Write a protein that binds this ligand. Structure first.
Ligand code: CBD
Ligand code: CBD
Ligand code: FMN
Ligand code: FMN
Lengths: 210, 210
């Protein structure tokens, strides 16, 4: 069983609630499954090429029957890095996302990463009725840290980071998805110590059954 | 009146549906208000620094009473571009966003850009019970091209590009928002030109009253 620990939190001075819950999960999981391989993909220190003019130019050449050698050096580096992210994602059995909420969504790279892992012929295929996912036997956890409370109630409609990630996962075939919110620390800093520990305990219990 | 034509498509108007509708709008607007200054901001050719460890360290240095000289060169370059993006956005009266739907949302640079224009003490401020916007007297349009139909009905909930952009715009204080969808060209290919032209007509009529 291969697990991808995919994180999108910059290594700043302040610390990270999401990272603390994520590391607690991964350590608890590794204790339960000493034989499973865990791979850390840090999105702030991984090449995650955005779909741009070069990527469209590479795609236009593939459509025109030309190969990889017809691409420029920059184009070659871009699609090789895209394919390596894609292959890694396809090869894993389990995905664990760790994300902060910025501006009611996730950091930009998370979108860049999803645009890398959602590829025709690889994670979805076209049908008469539109694209359908190809992935089977997958399972995913999303750990999101938020300043306010969005897990339940009215504000759930504006938790765009969570809701989009679940949709893309669902699109490619991964609809067995767990969710752990580390929420309300900026709303109630007085109980941020207890919110973190409650989420850590919730993570350690899930690792025993993930 | 100053208008920001903010585009996030690596293809030009000859190559994209939304950009064709976008160009139809901005040109029809310009004839109607020849005095108005229109600035095109192509996000695929603008320095839009992602919030990272460098940016957080820089912010920590400004808060600590230290000045611009306290930052490394890379920190200086990132915060200088972030401030130029912020200044340009703040001083504008109108914003037109042109966006394609990729993977049920917008391209990552759009989020990166939103992270540049939603800053504390500039476009929003803190209160006892949460952040609230500062921008007054602004109006926005979002033009989005989509393969399927997300305008109304069941799939409106998975239209994350449209919904998140409106939320951030609404959060910073830009309440007056317009929306045009160039939709269903992939779902009904033999009806694609008539969709484009119907959307172009919708854009031209809006320009007279935007
Ligand atoms: N930097 C921050 C920070 S901080 O951690 O660095 O202080 C925090 C932070 N969020 C942030 C969220 C909530 C609160 N405080 C706060 N307090 C109470 Cl008593 N109630 C609520 N309500 C509240 C507000 C928003 C959402 C949900 C809820 S809730 O009702 O479900 O609790 N919020 C506070 S506080 O600093 O004013 O206390 C900051 C943000 C930001 C942003 O930079 C930012 C940029 C663009 C858009 C949004 C934000 C943003 O929200
Ligand atoms: N490259 C594409 C393209 S392409 O045509 O430009 O090659 C197109 C494209 N979208 C895409 C959207 C719709 C259809 N076709 C298609 N046809 C019918 Cl008869 N019905 C529907 N229904 C449909 C499908 C999706 C959403 C909504 C509806 S709708 O019924 O409410 O209109 N779709 C087709 S088709 O190629 O199979 O014909 C591709 C996508 C992609 C993606 O790369 C992609 C990546 C990640 C996630 C999603 C996508 C994606 O959706
Ligand atoms: C740039 C930035 C944007 C933020 N935006 C939001 C927001 O829109 N809503 C919210 O509730 N909290 C927001 N926050 C607060 C963080 O989500 C919160 O501190 C969270 O714990 C960060 O995750 P981490 O602790 O794992 O780093 C923001 C923080 C930063 C630095
Ligand atoms: C990389 C990529 C991802 C896409 N993802 C989606 C999607 O999730 N849903 C959808 O309906 N259409 C999707 N499409 C189809 C486009 O939304 C549609 O072709 C649209 O016209 C593109 O906008 P543009 O013509 O302005 O570039 C995708 C197209 C590309 C190239």
């Amino acid at each position: 069983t291969k697990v991808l620990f995919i994180t999108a939190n910059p290594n700043s001075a302040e610390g990270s609630f999401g990272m603390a819950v994520g590391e607690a999960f991964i350590e608890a999981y590794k204790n339960e499954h000493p034989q499973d391989e865990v791979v850390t993909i840090d999105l702030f220190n991984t090449t995650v090429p955005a779909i741009d003019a070069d990527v469209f130019a590479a795609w236009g050449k593939f459509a025109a029957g030309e190969g990889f050698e017809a691409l420029t050096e920059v184009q070659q580096q871009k699609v090789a890095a895209m394919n390596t992210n894609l292959e890694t994602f396809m090869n894993a059995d389990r995905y664990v996302f760790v994300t902060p909420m910025w501006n009611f969504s996730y950091p930009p790279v998370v979108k860049a990463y999803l645009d890398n892992v959602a590829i025709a012929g690889k994670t979805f295929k076209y049908t008469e009725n539109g694209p359908v996912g190809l992935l089977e036997g997958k399972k995913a956890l999303h750990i999101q840290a938020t300043g306010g409370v969005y897990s339940e109630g009215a504000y759930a409609a504006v938790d765009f980071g969570r809701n989009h990630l679940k949709t893309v996962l669902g699109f490619v075939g991964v609809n067995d998805t767990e969710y752990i919110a580390v929420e309300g620390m900026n709303a109630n800093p007085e109980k941020a110590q207890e919110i973190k520990e409650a989420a850590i305990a919730n993570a350690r219990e899930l690792a025993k059954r993930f």
